Curated annotation (Swiss-Prot):
Source organism of the structure: Scylla paramamosain (Mud crab)
Molecular functions (GO terms): calcium ion binding; protein homodimerization activity
Identification of the protein by name: Sarcoplasmic calcium-binding protein
Chain ranges of the EF-hand domain: 17-41, 58-93, 102-137
Application notes: The Maillard reaction (glycation) and enzymatic cross-linking reaction are effective methods to reduce allergenicity for the industrial production of hypoallergenic crab meat.
Annotated coiled-coil segments of the chain: none
Entry note: thermal dependence: Stable at wide temperature range (4-100 degrees Celsius). Heating does not cause degradation, but leads to polymerization. The polymer content is highest at around 70 degrees Celsius.
Influence of pH: Relatively stable at broad pH range (pH 1-11). Dimers are formed in strongly acidic (pH 2-5) and alkaline (pH 10-11) conditions.
Length: 193
């Protein structure tokens, strides 16, 4: 589908936020791998067995929640189309606070990872590093043009995107069908997945 279509945006979220083993669908192995990845990134490569246990619990609960809401054919996997139906059911027409917990809790964690300097704002430097974590770019101006469209004058006055703003933009990213909405740039310039 068109790069900034709702279909491609939801497919992008499934690919990059959840499908860590890159096999095209979600299952328990993705969440096992996310538990380990989060542990090691939190530890700067150190493995803390208590941090790991905490993360394994968070990710097991997350997977149980997503499968409860999205496993339409009861096969223990959640496809892109199943995830899209859960988004239509539970996100479309709602603001972020009305999303189910399994669609909400993921953002706090991504935001904390992006916010390298811990000042509670994602600024342009942090956004550039986020963008190159998923995709290839030749032009820093392409990334910076996306940040400039994404952010409002109040975001720019603040020096970046706060957590509740990041969540507001995410809610529009995953729910608004308008391909021209500023929030379509949340994860950088897009291509078809
Ligand atoms: Ca997978
Ligand atoms: Ca399924
Ligand atoms: Ca920051
Ligand atoms: Ca920054
Ligand atoms: Na939930």
């Amino acid at each position: 589908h068109m790069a900034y279509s709702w279909d491609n945006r939801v497919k992008y979220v499934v690919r990059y936020m959840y499908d860590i083993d890159n096999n095209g669908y979600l299952d328990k192995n993705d969440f096992e791998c996310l538990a380990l990845r989060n542990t090691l990134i939190e530890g700067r490569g150190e493995f803390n067995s208590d941090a790991y246990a905490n993360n394994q619990k968070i990710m097991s609960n997350l997977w149980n929640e997503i499968a409860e809401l999205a496993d339409f054919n009861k096969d223990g996997q959640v496809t892109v189309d199943e995830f899209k139906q859960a988004v239509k059911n539970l996100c479309c027409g709602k603001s972020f606070d009305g999303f189910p917990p399994c669609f909400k809790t993921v953002i706090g964690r991504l935001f904390k990872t992006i916010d390298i300097n811990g000042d509670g704002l994602v600024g342009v430097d942090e956004y550039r590093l986020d963008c190159i974590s998923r995709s290839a770019f030749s032009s820093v101006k392409e990334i910076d043009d996306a940040y400039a469209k994404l952010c409002t004058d109040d975001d720019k006055k603040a020096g970046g995107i706060s957590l509740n703003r990041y969540q507001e933009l995410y809610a529009q990213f995953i729910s608004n069908p308008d391909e021209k909405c500023n929030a379509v740039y949340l994860f950088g310039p897009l291509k078809e997945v």
